[PDB]
Paper text:
The sample comprised two major classes: nsp131-BTC5 (3.4-Å nominal resolution) and nsp132-BTC5 (3.6 Å). To eliminate structural heterogeneity in the nsp13 subunits and obtain a higher-resolution view of the BTC, the particles from both classes were combined and locally refined inside a mask applied around the holo-RdRp and RNA (excluding the nsp13 subunits), leading to the BTC5(local) combined map (3.2 Å). The cryo-EM maps also resolved a single-stranded p-RNA 3′ segment of the BTC5 scaffold extruding into the RdRp NTP entry tunnel, confirming the formation of a BTC. By contrast, the BTC structures were translocated by one base pair compared to the RTCs; the base pair corresponding to the A–U Watson–Crick base pair at the 3′ end of the p-RNA (located in the −1 site of the RTCs) was in the −2 position of the BTCs. The −1 position of the BTC was occupied by the first C–A mismatch; the p-RNA −1C made a non-Watson–Crick hydrogen bond with the opposing t-RNA A. The next three mismatched p-RNA nucleotides (+1C, +2C, and +3C) trailed into the NTP entry tunnel. The 3′ nucleotide of the BTC5 scaffold p-RNA (+4C) was solvent-exposed at the outward-facing end of the NTP entry tunnel and lacked density and was therefore not modeled. The trajectory of the backtracked nucleotides at positions +1/+2 was sharply bent due to spatial constraints of motif F residues. The RdRp NTP entry tunnel provides a steric and electrostatic environment conducive to channeling the backtracked RNA out of the active site without specific polar protein–RNA interactions that could hinder the RNA movement. Our RdRp BTC structures suggest that in the absence of a Mg2+ ion D760 presents an electrostatic barrier to the phosphate backbone of the backtracked RNA, explaining the requirement for the helicase to surmount this barrier and why removal of D760 stabilizes binding to the BTC scaffolds.
The SARS-CoV-2 genome is replicated and transcribed by its RNA-dependent RNA polymerase holoenzyme [holo-RdRp, subunit composition nsp7/nsp82/nsp12 (3, 4)] in a replication–transcription complex (RTC), which is the target for antivirals such as remdesivir (Rdv). The nsp13 helicase translocates on single-stranded nucleic acid in the 5′→3′ direction. Translocation of each enzyme opposes each other, and if the helicase prevails it is expected to push the RdRp backward on the t-RNA. This reversible backward sliding, termed backtracking, is a well-studied feature of the cellular DNA-dependent RNA polymerases (DdRps). Our results establish that the SARS-CoV-2 RTC backtracks, that backtracking is facilitated by the nsp13 helicase, and that the resulting single-stranded 3′ segment of the p-RNA extrudes out the RdRp NTP entry tunnel in a manner analogous to the evolutionarily unrelated cellular DdRps.
Numbering used by the authors:
A (entry chain A): 3 to 929
B (entry chain B): 6 to 191
C (entry chain C): 1 to 75
D (entry chain D): 7 to 191
The structure:
RNA sequence: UAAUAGCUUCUUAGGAGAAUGACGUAGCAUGCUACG
RNA sequence: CGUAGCAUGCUACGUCAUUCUCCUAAGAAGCUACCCC
């Protein structure tokens, strides 16, 4: 009968139940298991068919979120789980079981009935937040609704899920905070209940209902009491991105950890929170067996800096934000008191102290003078307090007495070229080539409206058992090159007449500081940064250049004290990346002389069913997490295995994080604190961006390979690859270089890549991405959602199913297959509205004369030559327009020189710039 | 190079050759003097090449020593400028409250982010609209950073002084926002 | 072909206004910048001309800046 | 190149051409060959420096031209930009731009940015009765190719004056310039 | 008014290579004078 | 027939002048990627 069974499931507990499903039959539900056994492995959405489910209704016959799972299995498992439960009965964090044998048809089937679970479990929340798909997210909307995070109309908004268009979604996610945190606490109870009862078992995410209880004892072996061990390696690790997405540790800022009570008033002078970090770690992540040093200066290697830094990135969201930044100290120079920084307090790397503190100095050499002028200790200490309400970022001081509002003037108009263009039939109504790239102007509040975009950077706790394998795969990607510290005389500077940041720009360009410092005290500074931390002020400038849309473009000018040492540290690797051809990171490979065709042929590195793909990171340089930037700086500093020691590498990392990651930004006469994200003006910006891009691609591949079912995988080599990938991720702590090589070979075989710092072209296998054995666009959207805190809409990431058309867009240059000589080659052509926009609008009044600038239109015609092969005629006419304009320019130039003097130029070789052959030779593979 | 004796030898060889030609000298004498002229010319050309090389090297050395002198004359100038900047900011320090909080520290180290917050005597509040002005610093005294601040000046985005009576809800559109209000610690 | 003439005449007009030191008056410069950016980012010709009129009336408002009587006399 | 060195080389070349035309043998012909060759070497030496000078006097024509033209271009930027602006504004041939431009010539300039939204305020000075008669018909005010409803007319002393007083007989008694405050209709 | 990369044009300096010519020393062929 | 000397022609080494080519360094100007669509 279907009613006596329902009366038995209620048991002694007086509960009113409605049967989900029908007629004492199993209820089949699609859940989010974290499973690992002999055949299947991974964190994937399975379909469970062994649990009869009843829903409890309270008085007034309303349905509440409390279920009675009556999972049925064999008798041996029933008795084993009964004994394990009777060992763990007295624990508070164990769901109330009820073991009973019921006469189903002709035999006594033994059922175990868990009482007052929830509909979903912690794995469902973790999966729906880590594998987000805006088309199909019904286990996240239902979780948000049923726990009063939102009122079920919040989803009628156009973009509720977006982090950049709708920041209020964060306020929704934080409403799950105290529901996650209690769960963590329940684990620290349950682990103890195992430890004191001698039960060895694996704590999986799919066994904890969202209340916090634990209800699965199937795979628990009992040992002598008091000596058990709970394996929480794969429980806390998958939960880690949720502990900062939902801000599960906000209730630690309040006294007695109660959300109703007011905030804890920490001491303003308190900067050493080591004891508090250890207390938090020992309260929440108690059985996380790996050692945790709150200060990363005690870390064993570059894989323990990532682990402890990732932990501190969570534990630093409960501490006041005024206790971070530099740690100043009053020193004396020839009897006069300076206040200078003798360390730093990184949110990620903890407290770092300088080792060369010169108390009671006598003279200040140029190195010490440069150091004391660079750091913001004197600048912030001698400035007046600032309260800027235009931004949410912390504001330190105002150096001047008034705030400076900087504008961007409009660009000059080249009327001669525009009249010539409209004379040749351009710019008609309905023409396919139209002016779209203009010189936009900005008002006074632009410089501080753009810096406010750093509100998109949130403290993100990355999954640490997976990041420590993505690091290995990325380092395998970066194995071809070589690097190390170089002497001061080997440093090459491309352009010396550019500004040296703040405050050094008030006395000269970078040439002054590269000529005033001899090589001895230029190596002394670099050897100082290897044992000390130099905070640095970086200025924000507004760029004055042609653009498609009106939003301001700020660029960070970093001080010469930072660049002068970063070039020395990184330039060997930076010149080895920019001199290797045929690699994944295509930096330093020209698009001229048949270099684009070689790029596109090295992308197609013998993949089976090629489909091209490209993705765009929304707010790439402003929403990049601190952990991924530290990851990039550690992968880029792995080449220093012989030139410098471990402490030197750590202090170089601390200097990079103090001068790039979390710095003091001078934004219009005011020092603000940059929350994070890479600055676009340091030495290692494009290459660190490339490392981060490859990290995101490998993370998407790992997620796509794990989240596949495991029984649908027909290729028996890929199933074993998944089953070993899960082991090398969570069930393995040391590096397994054989499998790292195997997975890197798999990625090169099926996910061939081409990277320019965020411009990625992928030539993935279509069959595997269809089966899910390789990352697709939805996987990158999910990875960017749970790991970058941005939403990558599918309207800006493209996919090309035909290889005879090339990538749709790479480095803002479209690609087309054109016939040259007797063979077909790929030629890149720019946006044809960009060349006209550069011709018509110039950023200097002397660039409007025309006759003075014939070597300016030659370069534009060189960049716009491939348009001649384009099938559209209005595209092809842009090159002939520039050729005829160069001819007219030279004609009137010779006229003006024949007027100004009485003799023409004798040796004149401008007769080849209006010929198509000089530009056709620019895209020929000979040179 | 003309002062060298090689030029004199070349000139006297040419003069002897010309005198022999004008005097109707024999073939042997003419050819011998021509060969003497040749050996003088080769040595004079070598001397000229040596002089050109020496002069180009001396001029390059002068350029090198007139560039290093400028480098060492700018190094001292930027050093003096940096020392002046580091000492003016020192003379701007409030050595009463800063000294008190630093001596109050356990190890002497205090975070930089709280050096102004407890010692700065001047506060510059930048306000984008009237609602923020009403919320944070309405009136002539407001409380920020656990201290009482008194308004001393209000300027607009145009760096024009604005009287505190002009900042009203109806007069808000006629003001050039943002407003920078400068207050002093009390 | 008169749609793309407005997108350039507004550029020249904002250059003129910037050379007339309207950049110092922040309230007026914000309106001039917004009008210029809305003229450039305009697909419809009527909207571009309607905003061009408002951008030009900033130039005509200042009496002593330009000599409109002389400049238009060259026609 | 027809320089005196080339003249000597040319007469030597003509002598050697005559010798070749004879061209029997042998020692006098070799002597003519050596004399022609040394003359050619002297001419080439004294013409290479002339070519160098001709090349170096083309890096002082271009450098002077793209400096005089540069300073001329960046010196007349305040007036050339305005002339270009008004040339383009004549070229557009719009109805509203030409209307406000032709009104600004007579002195009928607006005191604020002309608003776009309906029922928005525009304060425009009208400095004479002649310009008032054309723009203002009844209570309607034609400006920027749009019709506006007049709210308040204030004379130069800021004293309000009703539209009944503004007439040809009583106009000289008023304190021009009037300021009309209209709302877009 | 930033980092890195690529490309175009011009100038200077240095090095290397090739060609032509002038000249100076070594080796080969031919003719003339003196001696054996 | 040999030796010494002179003269003429042909090869090898060195100096200088001219032309051309290539590279390495330095300097100056410009364009693009960058930023946004
Ligand atoms: C790595 C981890 C701890 C290492 C240790 O220190 N052991 C010490 C001795 C424990 N005892 C055997 C006594 C080992 C020790 C024994 C465990 C496994 C058992 O197969 C039973 C069970 C089989 C299922 O299919 C999958 C789950 C189980 C729980 C396994 C997972 C994991 O692998 C465990 C925790
Ligand atoms: C032997 C066993 C498996 C190998 C290891 C793995 C994780 C270890 C526990 C936690 O790390 C720290 C915790 C706090 C104190 O540090 C000492 C006691 C605790 C309970 C540890 C006991 C024991 O050592 C455990 C179970
Ligand atoms: C040699 C060359 C051409 C020789 C010629 O053919 N003359 C004959 C006259 C030409 N016709 C048609 C009037 C007859 C002459 C003609 C014009 C001369 C330049 C400018 O003036 C002045 C300028 C500034 C300084 O002064 C020195 C440099 C400059 C660049 C001069 C160099 C040189 O000296 C030029 C090119
Ligand atoms: N084919 C099967 N049929 C019924 N029960 C099974 C089967 N395979 C495994 N089980 C039992 O189910 C457990 C895994 O299911 P799980 O997802 O943990 O459910 P729950 O979380 O409700 O315990 C194992 O401990 C095992 O005893
Ligand atoms: Mg389970
Ligand atoms: Zn560590
Ligand atoms: Zn090193």
């Amino acid at each position: 009968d279907a009613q006596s069974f329902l009366n038995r499931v209620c048991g002694v507990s007086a509960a009113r139940l409605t049967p989900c499903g029908t007629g004492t039959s199993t209820d089949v539900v699609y859940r989010a298991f974290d499973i690992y056994n002999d055949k299947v492995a991974g964190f994937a959405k399975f379909l469970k068919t062994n649990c009869c489910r009843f829903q409890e209704k309270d008085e007034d016959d309303n349905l509440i979120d409390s279920y009675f799972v009556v999972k049925r299995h064999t008798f041996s498992n029933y008795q084993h789980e009964e004994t394990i439960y009777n060992l763990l009965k007295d624990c508070p964090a164990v769901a109330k079981h009820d073991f009973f044998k019921f006469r189903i048809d002709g035999d006594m089937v033994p059922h175990i009935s868990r009482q007052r679970l929830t509909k979903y479990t912690m794995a469902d929340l973790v999966y729906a937040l880590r594998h987000f798909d805006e088309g199909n997210c019904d286990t996240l909307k239902e979780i948000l609704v049923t726990y009063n995070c939102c009122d079920d109309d919040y989803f009628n908004k156009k973009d509720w899920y977006d982090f950049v268009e709708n920041p209020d979604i964060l306020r929704v996610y934080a409403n799950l905070g105290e529901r996650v945190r209690q769960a963590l606490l329940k684990t620290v109870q349950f682990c103890d209940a195992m430890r004191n009862a001698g039960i060895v078992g694996v704590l999986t995410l799919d066994n904890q209902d969202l209340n916090g209880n634990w209800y699965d004892f199937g795979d628990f072996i009992q040992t002598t009491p008091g000596s058990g061990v709970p394996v929480v390696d794969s429980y806390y690790s998958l939960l880690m991105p949720i502990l900062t997405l939902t801000r599960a540790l906000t209730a630690e800022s309040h006294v007695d950890t109660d959300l109703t009570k007011p905030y804890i008033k920490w001491d303003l002078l308190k900067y050493d929170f080591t004891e508090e970090r250890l207390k938090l770690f020992d309260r929440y992540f108690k059985y996380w067996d790996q050692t945790y040093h709150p200060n990363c200066v005690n870390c064993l290697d570059d894989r323990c800096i990532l682990h402890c830094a990732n932990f501190n990135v969570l534990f630093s969201t409960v501490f006041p934000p005024t206790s971070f930044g530099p740690l100043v100290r009053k020193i004396f120079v020839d009897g006069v008191p300076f206040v200078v920084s003798t360390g730093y307090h990184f949110r990620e790397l903890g407290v770092v102290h300088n080792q060369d503190v010169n108390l009671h100095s006598s003279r200040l050499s140029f190195k010490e003078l440069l150091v004391y002028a660079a750091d913001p200790a004197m600048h912030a200490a001698s400035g007046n307090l600032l309260l800027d309400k235009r931004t949410t970022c912390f504001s330190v001081a105002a150096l001047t007495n008034n705030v400076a509002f900087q504008t961007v003037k409009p660009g000059n108009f080249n009327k001669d070229f525009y009249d010539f263009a409209v004379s040749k039939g351009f710019f008609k109504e309905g023409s396919s080539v139209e002016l779209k790239h203009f010189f936009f102007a900005q008002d006074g509040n632009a410089a501080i409206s753009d810096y406010d975009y750093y509100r998109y950077n949130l403290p993100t706790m990355c999954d640490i058992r997976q990041l420590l394998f993505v690091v290995e795969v990325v380092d395998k990607y970066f194995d071809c090159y070589d690097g190390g510290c170089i002497n001061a005389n080997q440093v090459i500077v491309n352009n010396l007449d550019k500004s040296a940041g703040f405050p050094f720009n008030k006395w000269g360009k970078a040439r002054l500081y590269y000529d005033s410092m001899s090589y001895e005290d230029q190596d002394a500074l670099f050897a100082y940064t290897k044992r000390n931390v130099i905070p640095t002020i970086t200025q924000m400038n507004l760029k004055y250049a042609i653009s498609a849309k009106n939003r301001a473009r700020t660029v960070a000018g970093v001080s010469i004290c930072s660049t002068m040492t970063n070039r020395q540290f990184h330039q060997k690797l930076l010149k080895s990346i920019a001199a290797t051809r045929g690699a994944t990171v295509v930096i330093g490979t020209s698009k001229f002389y048949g270099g684009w065709h070689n790029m596109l042929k090295t992308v197609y590195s013998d993949v089976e069913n090629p489909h091209l793909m490209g993705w765009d990171y929304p707010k790439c340089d402003r929403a990049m997490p601190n952990m991924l930037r530290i990851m990039a700086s550690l992968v880029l500093a792995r080449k220093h295995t012989t030139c410098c020691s471990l402490s030197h590498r750590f202090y170089r990392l601390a200097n990079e994080c103090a001068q790039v990651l979390s710095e003091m930004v001078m934004c219009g006469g005011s020092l603000y604190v940059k929350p994070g994200g890479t600055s676009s003006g340091d030495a290692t910006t494009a290459y660190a961006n490339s490392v981060f891009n490859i990290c995101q691609a490998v993370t998407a591949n790992v997620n796509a390979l794990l989240s596949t079912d495991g029984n649908k995988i027909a290729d028996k080599y890929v199933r074993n690859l998944q089953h070993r990938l899960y082991e090398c991720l969570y069930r393995n702590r040391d590096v397994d270089t054989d499998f790292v090589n195997e997975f890197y070979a798999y990625l090169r075989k099926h996910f061939s890549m081409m990277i320019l710092s965020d411009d990625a072209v992928v030539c993935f296998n279509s069959t595997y991405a269809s089966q899910g054995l390789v990352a697709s666009i939805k996987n990158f959207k999910s990875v960017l959602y749970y790991q970058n805190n941005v939403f990558m809409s599918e309207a800006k990431c493209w996919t090309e199913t035909d290889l005879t058309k090339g990538p749709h867009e790479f480095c803002s240059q479209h690609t087309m297959l054109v016939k040259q000589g007797d063979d077909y080659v790929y030629l890149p052509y720019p946006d044809p509205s960009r060349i006209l926009g550069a011709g018509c609008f110039v950023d200097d009044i002397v660039k409007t004369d025309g006759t003075l600038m014939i070597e300016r239109f030659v370069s534009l015609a060189i960049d716009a030559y491939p348009l001649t092969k384009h099938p559209n005629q209005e595209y092809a006419d842009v090159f002939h327009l520039y050729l005829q304009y160069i001819r007219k320019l030279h004609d009137e130039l010779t006229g003006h020189m024949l007027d100004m003097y009485s003799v023409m130029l004798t040796n004149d070789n401008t007769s080849r710039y209006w010929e198509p052959e000089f530009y056709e030779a620019m895209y020929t593979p000979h040179t | 190079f003309s002062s060298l004796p090689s030029y004199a030898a070349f000139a006297t060889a040419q003069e002897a050759y010309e005198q022999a030609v004008a005097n109707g000298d024999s073939e042997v004498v003419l050819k011998k003097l021509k060969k003497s002229l040749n050996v003088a010319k080769s040595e004079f050309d070598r001397d000229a090449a040596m002089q050109r090389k020496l002069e180009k090297m001396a001029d390059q050395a002068m350029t090198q020593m007139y560039k290093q002198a400028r480098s060492e004359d700018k190094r001292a100038k930027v050093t003096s400028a940096m020392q002046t900047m580091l000492f003016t900011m020192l003379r701007k320090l409030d050595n009463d409250a800063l000294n008190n909080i630093i001596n109050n520290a356990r190890d002497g180290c205090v975070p930089l982010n709280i050096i102004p917050l407890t010692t700065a005597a001047k506060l510059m509040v930048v306000i984008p609209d009237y609602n923020t002005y009403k919320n944070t610093c309405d009136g002539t005294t407001f409380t920020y950073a656990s201290a009482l601040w008194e308004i001393q000046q209000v300027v607009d985005a145009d760096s024009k002084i604005v009287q505190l009576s002009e900042i009203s809800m109806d007069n808000s559109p006629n003001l050039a926002w943002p407003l920078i209000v400068t207050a002093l610690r009390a | 072909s008169k749609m793309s003439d407005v997108k350039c005449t507004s550029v020249v007009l904002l250059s003129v206004l910037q050379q007339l030191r309207v950049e110092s008056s922040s309230k007026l410069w914000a309106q001039c910048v917004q009008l210029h950016n809305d003229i450039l980012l305009a697909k419809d010709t009527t909207e571009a001309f309607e905003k061009m009129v408002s951008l030009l009336s900033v130039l005509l408002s200042m009496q002593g800046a330009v000599d409109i009587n002389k400049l238009c006399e060259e026609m």
